[PDB]
Amino acid sequence: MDYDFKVKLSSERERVEDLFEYEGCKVGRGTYGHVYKAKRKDGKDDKDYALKQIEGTGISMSACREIALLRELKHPNVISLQKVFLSHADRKVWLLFDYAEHDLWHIIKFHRAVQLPRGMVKSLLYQILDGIHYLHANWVLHRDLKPANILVMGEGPERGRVKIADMGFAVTFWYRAPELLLGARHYTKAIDIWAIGCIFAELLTSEPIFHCRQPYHHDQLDRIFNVMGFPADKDWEDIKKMPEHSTLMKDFRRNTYTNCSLIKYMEKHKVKPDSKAFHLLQKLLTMDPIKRITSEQAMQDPYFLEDPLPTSDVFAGCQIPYPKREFLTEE
Amino acid sequence: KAMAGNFWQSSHYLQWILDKQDLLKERQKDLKFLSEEEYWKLQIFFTNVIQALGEHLKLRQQVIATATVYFKRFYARYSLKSIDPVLMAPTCVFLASKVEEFGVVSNTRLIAAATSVLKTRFSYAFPKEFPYRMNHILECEFYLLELMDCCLIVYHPYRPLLQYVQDMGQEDMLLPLAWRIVNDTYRTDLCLLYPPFMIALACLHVACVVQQKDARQWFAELSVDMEKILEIIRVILKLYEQWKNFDERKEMATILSKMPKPKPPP
Numbered sequence: 001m002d003y004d005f006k007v008k009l010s011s012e013r014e015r016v017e018d019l020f021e022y023e024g025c026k027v028g029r030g031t032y033g034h035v036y037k038a039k040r041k042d043g044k045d046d047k048d049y050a051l052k053q054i055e056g057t058g059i060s061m062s063a064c065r066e067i068a069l070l071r072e073l074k075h076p077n078v079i080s081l082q083k084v085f086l087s088h089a090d091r092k093v094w095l096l097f098d099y100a101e102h103d104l105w106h107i108i109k110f111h112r113a114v115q116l117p118r119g120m121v122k123s124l125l126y127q128i129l130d131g132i133h134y135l136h137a138n139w140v141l142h143r144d145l146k147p148a149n150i151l152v153m154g155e156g157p158e159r160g161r162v163k164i165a166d167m168g169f170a171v172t173f174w175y176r177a178p179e180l181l182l183g184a185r186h187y188t189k190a191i192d193i194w195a196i197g198c199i200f201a202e203l204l205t206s207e208p209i210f211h212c213r214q215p216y217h218h219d220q221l222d223r224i225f226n227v228m229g230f231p232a233d234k235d236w237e238d239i240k241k242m243p244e245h246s247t248l249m250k251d252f253r254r255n256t257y258t259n260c261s262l263i264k265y266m267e268k269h270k271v272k273p274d275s276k277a278f279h280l281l282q283k284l285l286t287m288d289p290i291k292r293i294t295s296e297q298a299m300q301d302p303y304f305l306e307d308p309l310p311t312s313d314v315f316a317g318c319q320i321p322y323p324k325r326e327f328l329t330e331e
Numbered sequence: 332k333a334m335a336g337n338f339w340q341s342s343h344y345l346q347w348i349l350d351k352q353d354l355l356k357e358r359q360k361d362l363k364f365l366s367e368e369e370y371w372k373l374q375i376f377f378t379n380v381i382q383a384l385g386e387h388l389k390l391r392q393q394v395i396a397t398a399t400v401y402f403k404r405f406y407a408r409y410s411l412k413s414i415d416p417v418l419m420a421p422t423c424v425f426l427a428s429k430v431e432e433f434g435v436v437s438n439t440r441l442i443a444a445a446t447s448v449l450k451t452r453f454s455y456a457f458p459k460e461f462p463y464r465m466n467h468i469l470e471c472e473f474y475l476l477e478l479m480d481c482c483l484i485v486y487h488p489y490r491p492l493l494q495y496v497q498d499m500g501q502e503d504m505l506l507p508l509a510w511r512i513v514n515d516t517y518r519t520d521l522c523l524l525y526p527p528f529m530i531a532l533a534c535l536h537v538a539c540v541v542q543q544k545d546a547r548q549w550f551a552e553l554s555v556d557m558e559k560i561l562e563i564i565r566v567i568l569k570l571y572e573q574w575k576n577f578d579e580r581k582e583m584a585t586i587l588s589k590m591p592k593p594k595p596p597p
């Protein structure tokens with residue numbers, strides 16, 4: 001490589017350490033790498049950013065796909081890539097996102113330990129639906145939707161805005177659609193919609209609807225049938241075409257679940273089966289993926305026209321009682 | 332088919348459709364060493380190296396096209412002496428292969444493809460073996476991704492060409508030739524200057540004239556700037572005259588020796 005070109009680039013290259021203060025501000029460590037709550041050293045910007053050093057070196061398939069997609073996606077309810085820093089000496093990649101103080105895992109947990117207000121649940125569901133509709137319209141599947149990935153913005157100019165995160169760019173099964181558990185070989189839009197149905201139930205009751213003790217997972221299916229009932233042939237005609245259909249027939253009898261229904265489960269948790277909430281939830285939690293509602297159809301549901309209307313800020317101008325993210329050690 | 336209808340909000344459109352004057356302004360540094368003629372001949376040559384690398388690696392045409400767009404973007408901005416284009420060609424194919432969901436082409440398979448393609452199919456240009464190893468590809472990848480500002484998703488004319496020929500009801504008659512003509516457009520700067528759908532309309536038009544198919548009414552019924560389409564047809568007709576008059580195999584050793592060389596360290 002030409003020497004003049006090399007030094008000019010090394011002179012002018014923005015380095016993550018020079019632009020951002022993140023010493024001792026680690027908020028996450030996982031398989032993804034390390035994430036910090038960072039502020040600009042320059043001072044002109046006052047906002048916090050989420051600063052991720054990706055795990056490993058170089059540019060893996062998953063890193064490449066994540067950078068490639070996040071570089072194109074632009075929507076209020078999907079968390080957006082602000083900048084990429086490439087550190088050449090060590091071949092480490094840093095991604096800068098907008099910082100979300102909260103998420104549904106921590107919010108639901110705060111209420112499970114004081115009911116989760118029903119205006120907030122509607123507003124959360126709508127913004128989740130809006131974000132996934134945008135992704136689905138661009139043929140981008142999430143592939144692992146759950147409360148941990150549904151981030152919510154804290155105080156600032158995007159207060160109470162849902163931000164979808166951690167799309168599948170390239171254990172617990174509580175949010176997995178029954179076709180996945182019966183051996184379906186491909187992720188679909190419908191699989192994301194089932195997961196959204198599970199989250200909505202959990203937001204209404206504070207309990208994961210298909211909670212189960214830790215492709216074919218018998219106990220997870222048992223919990224879906226204890227909640228939903230066992231599907232009649234008429235409800236899911238192509239269930240016979242699922243790879244694990246005979247295993248299902250071997251292990252399960254429909255007789256076992258004859259007193260089970262979504263209506264009975266939700267009634268136990270003080271959600272009326274005549275409510276628009278419930279009718280929407282039942283459309284999202286349809287066992288047959290081809291009979292499941294789409295994100296667009298769900299957004300048009302009359303649930304969202306019923307008092308109270310959804311709000312842009314899911315906290316509705318009220319005080320945020322949820323605690324800020326804990327700092328972690330560098331160990 | 333990720334991001335397939337997002338072109339008008341895409342990084343390709345908003346950042347990587349360049350003005351022709353800026354392109355030819357940045358190119359003047361390399362035009363001290365090479366003539367205009369020799370520069371377009373280099374572009375043809377390195378397009379063919381990249382096609383041969385993809386063919387050897389059994390990659391789909393879309394992945395080859397994306398790799399070719401990367402290579403062109405780099406040298407639209409920087410001189411040919413910045414990084415050896417012999418290094419850059421396989422780097423672009425490696426990076427494009429990771430984007431397009433085929434695979435992280437094996438390190439040993441990327442290098443073997445590079446070595447064998449230059450020995451077997453380009454010995455007239457390259458008498459010495461491919462001198463680079465995987466650590467050189469890996470360094471280059473970081474430079475390439477930085478210059479492209481991490482813009483990895485590239486739109487091509489293939490998809491809209493297929494939609495247009497289906498609307499005509501002339502897939503079997505016109506598609507093969509229109510498709511090969513879209514492949515040929517990558518020998519030129521077009522992919523940096525016009526949106527892909529306009530390139531597909533130009534290639535389809537040239538295919539209709541070559542095969543003597545009257546499509547005047549269909550083209551009349553489109554809501555498009557035909558002055559822009561005629562500019563593209565004019566470049567497509569020019570490239571076949573350039574093709575006729577160019578012997579890559581006789582000329583390329585001499586042209587490559589005239590390329591500006593990198594400065595070493597002090």
Ligand SMILES: Nc1[nH]nc2cc(-c3cncc(Cl)c3N3CCC4(CCNC4=O)CC3)ccc12
Nearest residue numbers: 027028032035050052079097098099100165166
């Ligand atoms: N301890 C933690 N629990 N949940 C967390 C979420 C964040 C977070 C905040 N704002 C913005 C983004 Cl983008 C965030 N992240 C972190 C990085 C992640 C988590 C999975 N893979 C990722 O790349 C995507 C969401 C940080 C700390 C958190």
